Ligand binder design. Sequence first.
Ligand SMILES: Nc1ncnc2c1ncn2[C@@H]1O[C@H](COP(=O)(O)OP(=O)(O)O)[C@@H](O)[C@H]1O
Ligand SMILES: Nc1ncnc2c1ncn2[C@@H]1O[C@H](COP(=O)(O)OP(=O)(O)O)[C@@H](O)[C@H]1O
Ligand SMILES: Nc1ncnc2c1ncn2[C@@H]1O[C@H](COP(=O)(O)OP(=O)(O)O)[C@@H](O)[C@H]1O
Ligand SMILES: [Mg+2]
Ligand SMILES: [Mg+2]
Ligand SMILES: [Mg+2]
Ligand SMILES: [Zn+2]
Lengths: 610, 227, 581
Amino acid sequence: DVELREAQRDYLDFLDDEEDQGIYQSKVRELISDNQYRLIVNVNDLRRKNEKRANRLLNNAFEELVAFQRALKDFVASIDATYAKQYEEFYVGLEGSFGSKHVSPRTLTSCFLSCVVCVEGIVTKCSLVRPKVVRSVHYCPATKKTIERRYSDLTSVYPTKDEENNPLETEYGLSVYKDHQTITIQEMPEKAPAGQLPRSVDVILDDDLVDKAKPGDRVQVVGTYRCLPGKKGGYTSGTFRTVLIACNVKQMSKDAQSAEDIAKIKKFSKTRSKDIFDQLAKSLAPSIHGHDYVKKAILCLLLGGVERDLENGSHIRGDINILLIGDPSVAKSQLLRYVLCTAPRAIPTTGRGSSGVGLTAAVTTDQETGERRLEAGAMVLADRGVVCIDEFDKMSDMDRTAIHEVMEQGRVTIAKAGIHARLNARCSVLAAANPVYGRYDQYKTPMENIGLQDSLLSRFDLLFIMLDQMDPEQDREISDHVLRMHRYRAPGEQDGDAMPLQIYEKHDNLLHGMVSAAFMKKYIHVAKIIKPVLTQESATYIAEEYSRLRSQDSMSSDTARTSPVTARTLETLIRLATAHAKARMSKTVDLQDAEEAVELVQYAYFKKVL
Amino acid sequence: QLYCDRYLCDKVVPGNRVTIMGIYSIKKFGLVGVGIRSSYIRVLGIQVDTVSPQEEEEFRRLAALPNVYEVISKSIAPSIFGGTDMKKAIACLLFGGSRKRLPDGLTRRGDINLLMLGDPGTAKSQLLKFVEKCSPIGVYTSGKGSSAAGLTASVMRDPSSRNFIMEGGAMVLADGGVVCIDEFDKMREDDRVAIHEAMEQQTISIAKAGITTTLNSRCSVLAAANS
Amino acid sequence: LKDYALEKEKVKKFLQEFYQDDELGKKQFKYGNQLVRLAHREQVALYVDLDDVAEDDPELVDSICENARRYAKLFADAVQELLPQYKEREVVNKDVLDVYIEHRLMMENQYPAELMRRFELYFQGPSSNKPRVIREVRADSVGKLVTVRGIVTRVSEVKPKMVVATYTCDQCGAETYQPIQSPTFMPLIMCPSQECQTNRSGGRLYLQTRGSRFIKFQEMKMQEHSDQVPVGNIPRSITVLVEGENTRIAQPGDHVSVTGIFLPILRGLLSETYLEAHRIVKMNKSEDELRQIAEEDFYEKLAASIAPEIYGHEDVKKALLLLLVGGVDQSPKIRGNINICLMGDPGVAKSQLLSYIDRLAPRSQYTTGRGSSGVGLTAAVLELTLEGGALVLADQGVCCIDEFDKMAEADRTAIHEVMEQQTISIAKAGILTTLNARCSILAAANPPAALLSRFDLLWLIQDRPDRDNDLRLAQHITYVHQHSRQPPSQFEPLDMKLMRRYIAMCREKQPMVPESLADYITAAYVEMRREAWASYTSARTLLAILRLSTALARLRMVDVVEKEDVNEAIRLMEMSKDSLL
DNA sequence: TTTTTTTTTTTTTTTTTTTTTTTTT
DNA sequence: AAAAAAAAAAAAAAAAAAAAAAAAA
Ligand SMILES: Nc1ncnc2c1ncn2[C@@H]1O[C@H](COP(=O)(O)OP(=O)(O)O)[C@@H](O)[C@H]1O
Ligand SMILES: Nc1ncnc2c1ncn2[C@@H]1O[C@H](COP(=O)(O)OP(=O)(O)O)[C@@H](O)[C@H]1O
Ligand SMILES: Nc1ncnc2c1ncn2[C@@H]1O[C@H](COP(=O)(O)OP(=O)(O)O)[C@@H](O)[C@H]1O
Ligand SMILES: [Mg+2]
Ligand SMILES: [Mg+2]
Ligand SMILES: [Mg+2]
Ligand SMILES: [Zn+2]
């Protein structure tokens, strides 16, 4: 086959990346070093190096991918034959910019059959992983003969009797299976037209991809679109069943996860080892003005404290739960929106938009196998993440009491007669609230300005009252900030048109009169891994502070507690202190972190009553 | 039963009022009713019942008029008498402001929300009907949704097919346009909270036992009400 | 390349010439004795601990774990060949199938090996083989010997699965035998007996269950521990098909490590999977020196060892200790369980103690609020089988109920029956039974005659502020966050593994109330009656005294309750009621 | 070998009960 | 705060339309 030989030669030449930037040679070194047998190749590279090869690969996926994989196996054999001998086949995944192939399940028309398609969609079905045999081995006790039979990928006869009718006992251990799964993906409800029902498509996942995507996750699947046949039969209808044989599955949450950036982070941490936390917090939500303490507290929510697992298996949560009660138009919902945009695995929700079994996980019947199955609820999905609950007050109290366990111990215990489980929900809850009566009556105690019972207020470690004080100077400042924001226009990209349906950022005068959001994201992500240890002086300081906080004297006349001070408060201090330590890469919770958390708690837990 | 083909697929969506020109045909599948073959139409022509540069220049010159605001103000509810300020405000709502997304990613809605409280005598439901008939994308509805057409979107999972069916309310259907809510004071608690979120953020966040999501409802609300 | 005759020789050598000094420095030829016992029909399962094999043949163990069914069959056949040369006497015909086996052998185209085994063998996974998470058991480990840990969610009922079907012909009198490997088999209709073949007769033969071979069979679904599920995923469940002597070993909710074979069942050639169980072990709470126990303070030590990181609450822990031990059932039928409800203000470590008891009590269930309600507590109908809820799974255990106050009203009504009747009477549409739930309820709630009158102890916890008391607690808590271990004290707290044995050791010590203490107990009871009357105390209170007093008697392991226990039992009542005031 | 009747499976809908939720005293 | 009525969930049963395999001659 001249065409196939040419394709393989071109692909091998591409993979032979030493004269060029050495990107794919390094990628092959990566895949061999970490012991995986699938390579991911950016299509943009094929377009940049050979447009004919890229077009052929995209328009005729099957044979081109076969040639590419064979060239990949040859190249890995050349670089190392020992590893290359381990795996029968080396697979390939694609990614990049798919000009016209990038579509959704709705736009997926029969025109793309036998082509390469990079679809984006919401996963609806994930079937059980089954081992599909590819090579069977059968042993005959009578004849002592071991017979191997191959099973080509024809996406059938299984031998049982020898030539002279001697029973064959299959050798399961020596047989070769590849794990295989089928999922059903759907077009994102956001981009689907509001009127008609959702449109979906099947996807078939071989090894290395069987469980790369879980139900109810927004994913991008790159693969080949082909037609399935019916079973043997004299008559057939022109109808054909089409699936997307995936070559790569990726989580669209690129936010979920270089030496230059690491060096930048190290230098930024070491430069001023005192006020990095304040500089970050001030830069947390640039569009919003004021609320320095609230921004500080949120910065602690993003970092979070440190979880403690004792020898007895006891669990002490290391996440920080924050509540923001506010008069109308004080940017609490805007802060929740920012947390959604920035914090990874930030699950939004609203008061009555998630009732009972939807907010937390649920249990149903499979309805096909008759077997009970769990249902990842709104918050169990938010494990190791943030849950932004807006309009918290309007929730039915049943839902509220259905959050205490996840808020405190971070696990949801659900059990019906058939099945029982304790799903992991280690999420930090950021709740927004409009105080009873709509607006905050400063001439009433914060206790009666909040309709929540004492226990739930205890659940929240920090409770911020954000009043709509109109101090004319403060109103002038807020108006200046807002109007400057409303005037801002994107640099160069815009010139008076409308919107269709580095450590430090450049200092604009219309936004400043701070640190980059991307740099802030990277620094926060790296800092979140640090695990500081409390110091003896810090422990004594926090203990004394908690002792006074419980003491009546800590509150003067006409000042009331915004929430009861109990054991949790103490942990909050630690957690908050821990958070402040993580901002400085401290690795040791010194006194500065403890006292900063202490002042934060003192500000949060007492309100002056007029 | 209609049967489409290469380019006729998805030229219509359920609910369209259509005129179909096709070949009256029966199924041909390997051959008390006897010899009855289910009949269907082979669709060949579809007509769905209900900007040129000249019109672009027409709009350009219309805007350039010194009193463009006045002519627009007097050109929305000519039949309705009085209420010039209300008509000006409704024109402003129709044109809307500008949506802003700051570099941090936060969005400032550019769609105006208007409310009209008054005695039941004034022509305000008529005004809402005109607004829904004049806005490019617009939907009229009552406080408690409409007739078999909810106000806000809902999500349910088909127990058989197990999909995520999104039953669209007036808000999501009216994305990028106007929703005229008559009797805006008689909503239901769930809908009250939903609109509470939507009118400011422009998004309806719904999380069911299946999935969490945030439908985009960038609608300008025009509400009518009595004391 | 891989012979099996040499493998048979190797396994026979291992079985015949392997030994250990387990029993007080005595070389005893570990597997020779087991073979002898098998030949005498006094033992039915021969567990071949692969650790023993690896001690002298690493490559054989590598091959075994790399290929399971083949070597299982090889070991079975080797044991079959070794049985004749180890039998020393004549068996007494233990069961009918042995009689049929002997008659077949005496009357003796061959008898299938599986028809004459009457002995099972199973591998215990080598120590070098780390137990593998269910989620990571995939195609690459099909047919291998893997060990996986999980929670038994639902186990089917023991049923007879036929291994070798035996038919008898109506003409020749010969027996036809059919080994069974597929889940379903085609019954033979004509006899292949050589006599009828020669005669050319109808040969219509009838299946006989008298001669056929049946084995115990059970199907279970086991989940993943919550500690090993991925961050954004849910626990995965795997099927296990136990058989033979591996049945009736695991109940629902039992934490089990199972070593079996990951084999597919034939349905491209897509195939489901399952684990063919070989070794089942109950782990953690489900798991199955004297000088300190005889100590006077041993009672305090267990109490102080219950959640040591929880400072204070000295009295409460001492009361929960009795709940774990429980009173003694008397059937003149009065329950012997103790129900303690911890009611208090938020953040007084109510939940932590409730969570700690779950990780300590042998059988326990921790249900929180309305997450597991309705059928979560009681049973449901799921052929239609009956599945029990937390109470049933917690039967003869400790059901830790959190936020009891905010529980569904129907669920509270169901509990009322359990804490008095210790049963669950259901008369729903599809359900009409009377379950058995002899479980001790440990309720946690926040601030009731509807609840006070039921629980034997209603401990009220209030974290009233205090300058110095709070400071001590802060030092305690901050220490825990600093070292992950409770603050050191005069005595090292007992480990949970050690504690379970101690508590279990005290269960089977039913003591008796002497006539001497009747006057004391009656005198004590009447006073308790007046205090509530003067300032609720009913006949229940006297029972609470007796159950608590017996609980202490078990701790001291005295078969006769002494006056000190009554005083200590009352002292807890005093603090419990004084907590209310 | 070739038909035929069954077997399934794969969707979809429908009905009863139970449970959960909302409104009223 | 608790009971009465309503609504929704969920599970089991029925229709049925069509594709494939086993038994019959
Ligand atoms: N302190 C502030 N700084 C900047 N913008 C603000 C501030 N207070 C209010 N705003 C503006 O007012 C609007 C109200 O936001 P939102 O949080 O949705 O309302 P609420 O606070 O009532 O939930 C936002 O769009 C925000 O831009
Ligand atoms: N200013 C007005 N000009 C013209 N017609 C009017 C005016 N005010 C009331 N009407 C007439 O009175 C009727 C009542 O108006 P409508 O909008 O239905 O009141 P509502 O909004 O209270 O239901 C309408 O049919 C309308 O034609
Ligand atoms: N007496 C105590 N000793 C140690 N820790 C305590 C104590 N009381 C409360 N805590 C801490 O408070 C946190 C939450 O306690 P929790 O069990 O939720 O309280 P409750 O359930 O009584 O409201 C736990 O992490 C625990 O460490
Ligand atoms: Mg808001
Ligand atoms: Mg009207
Ligand atoms: Mg609690
Ligand atoms: Zn015969």
